[PDB]
Amino acid sequence: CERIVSKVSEEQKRRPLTVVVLGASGDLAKKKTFPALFQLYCDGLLPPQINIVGYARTKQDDVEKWKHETLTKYFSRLHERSCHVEPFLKHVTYFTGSYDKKEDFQRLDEHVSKLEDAFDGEEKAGDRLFYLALPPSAFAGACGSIRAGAMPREGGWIRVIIEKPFGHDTESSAELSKAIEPFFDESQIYRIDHYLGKEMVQNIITTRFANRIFSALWNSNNIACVQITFKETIGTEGRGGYFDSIGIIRDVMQNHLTQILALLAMEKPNSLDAERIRDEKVSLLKCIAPIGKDDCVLGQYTASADGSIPGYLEDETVPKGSTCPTFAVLRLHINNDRWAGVPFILKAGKAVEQKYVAIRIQFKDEIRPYGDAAQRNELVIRAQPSEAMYMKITTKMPGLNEDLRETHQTELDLTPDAYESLISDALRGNSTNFVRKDELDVAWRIFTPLLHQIDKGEVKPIPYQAGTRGPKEADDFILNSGFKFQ
Template sequence: MVSRVIPVQSFDLVLFGATGDLARRKILPSLFHRFQLGQFSDSSRIIGASRSDMDVDSFRERVAEAVREFGQQDEVNDKDIAAFVTLLDYVAIDAKGDRGWDELATHMRPDMVRAFYLSVAPSLFGDIATRLRSTGIATDDSRIVVEKPFGHDLASAQALNKALRANFEESQIYRIDHYLGKETVQNLMALRFANSLFEPLWNSSHIDHVQITVAESIGVEGRGEYYDRSGAMRDMVQNHLMQLLCLTAMEPPGNFTPDAVRNEKVKVIEALEPVENSDIARGQYRGHDGQASYRDHAGDPDSQTESFIAMKVQVANWRWAGTPFYLRTGKCLRERASEIAVFFRDPPHNIFQGSDPAKGNVLVIRLQPDEGITLHTTIKDPGPGGMRLTQAALDMTFADSLPHDERPQDAYERLIMDVIRGNQTLFMRGDEVEAAWAWADPIIAGWDGTRHAPLPYDIGSSGPEDSLRLLHRDERSWRSIGK
């Protein structure tokens, strides 16, 4: 495989929570693949840090097992693993105490990019940030990466921001959302702002509505207790779907720089209208024929937490006035699929007498499982018999014309390398997070105050019936998941 990657500057990456599930499944395999492709400079190192007592050799073997299990199977080989683990070191550390910090300081080298990845509970963000600064391990140009959930509400998000900013400048803080690292999400920006075809039509005069769907086929098994404190609104809408909404609705930035892009995203969030309960459908999956229900997984027989939510959202500005955005996400749905579907308005007049009217075009940006972009168009149905219209899909992924010498990067691969480069474009800014919570909190309080219980839906369905009525009353319908 020929690599087209450019090596990044040499770095010391400290991975807190290095023995945790996210590190094992995503972070370490992603780092291994970037190493395989030659993106690491020779002197770069990864230092694992966690509470677990183990020596360096044990940690290296643990990482090797993680790469073999979760790495790309057609690319994993013992030779590359053996080379990769030589870059690893390990420190047993107490985030709230003194143990391990002096030892970690001895591993830090001058003239290296220093990055600290906090794959730990948010309750430890402040403690670790304070220790990094007070021990001198963090320098003025170090980077700190924090995972979601970034707060449970506006007050907790503000507290986390305050704790981080007490030790790091905003320019050093990388709040990671892996959805923003997906190739197709970035292609959305290229599609809009690098082509003259779509942007003149990207407004309420030409777009009827937008559907943003993140559907999962699995339930909350294994994380039911955590999820029951969160629900679909906090777990998915406030962050992942909000980011997709912002990138779809934002104004063109003056230039492609981190703050220019993020300024426009904040403006979208600030323009969101409050959402009434009548514009929301909440659901909770139920089991049948021996299947476990949401409440079985959550361990609470009376849980009122939603595993599904759909809502109608309005962006109150000149570009989008009158064009609704419909958001939906849920667990245990028919299939796994994430997409943004932009529905253009129908042609104003049907000139083809005797045929069905032409329907508006639909631009579908697929995020998973198969990333790509498709434009659904109306064409003549082939064959004799007059002018009959039918729908056809125009594949816009350009797969055959793009190089095949490297598989698409995993989102974590791209984002971690952006941290090393010091590029914050695909990371959330503190005011962006707080603005999203300021919008979400009243919505959550609205259904809490009315005891608006989620409606049951069957495992393998498209969600509760109320989500269908949400669009039917507007004489619209949801796009079939995965089609």
């Protein structure tokens, strides 16, 4: 088994802690939220007497059976952590109610207050964290109800975790933020982009700013172009109607890839304080002009030739004549002194040749003295499927060589669920890996004018068979932007 070596600091063990997972009956709560909380318990990252309340509309008389038949169904690491399932379920309580009625949360307040009073310690106020595993339409309703009937006692803080999507353009995203402003401020709101919980994404800051080697190289004097890529082999898999209202740009590019870009391209914060980091992300995103339709190439997958994967338009739930892109390559211009003139390419596509998420930074040629005998250096950071970071460089050919122009390309290779990382950050009050309100609005303004043009029909996707790389025009667009594919 494993003895739980509590890694929680002593300051976090003094007051009651309550985690209320609204929508505990939902898919996300039981597939991602509770498994992350269970993993946090095993890692010793939960205070000794935390309270976890599962809030839901559906009532279950199986108070102790629902905890043991639906919750652990989607658990993991059961060949090494089975010893602690029951002690973790000891902390889990169930509470039924609506997500938008004020009195339902006054009942929760007294129910949680019952749990807060049972804590071992003088302080009974308790910290309260709300995880809104709810549809976006319920966010405003839940936030108002929590503020009106479930605020913590005098003392302990309150934090609300909300997840994507935050609207589908600038206006819709701003209206959701407008509705939440009366109830909580930015210091209490924790917006989740789960890519910010990934190990490789979090390592961008340390790679760039803890090392002189990367610090001195990370500008337009040495970098020729930057590409950030999201690739999936699967298609819509029958849920094309759900995807058709989103598209590949909203799904992964406006949020996931843009978050990576901000960490890749931002200036150095003076300290590692959370808000200094987020200031630099916002400051970077403000240097980016809105993407025009001349900086984009869209695609829509057809059949997989081998029939294995059907066409996107061959799905009945997809309205016919749909202009929804399943593929997109976008060119961004970062107007500041570090990145002026450097092409940034965001590439995302479903039903392509491989499953792949990576960053590719191309450095400029060292023109002399090697010329054609050298190639551009590259820094590659891969997140999926297997984490990796390596440098591609030019080295002398091993063995007896007749002249120094005999070279070859070589590599210098480097030798936890996102929600676990994000939830622990929220518990400790670290907002570094959460989307601030102004960051959200600036990010939306970059992509929204293009998204409106796509919906109006001003851009038509290019058909490509599932399993190929995508439209040929996409690769020609990348080469014409300044990339040298090798």
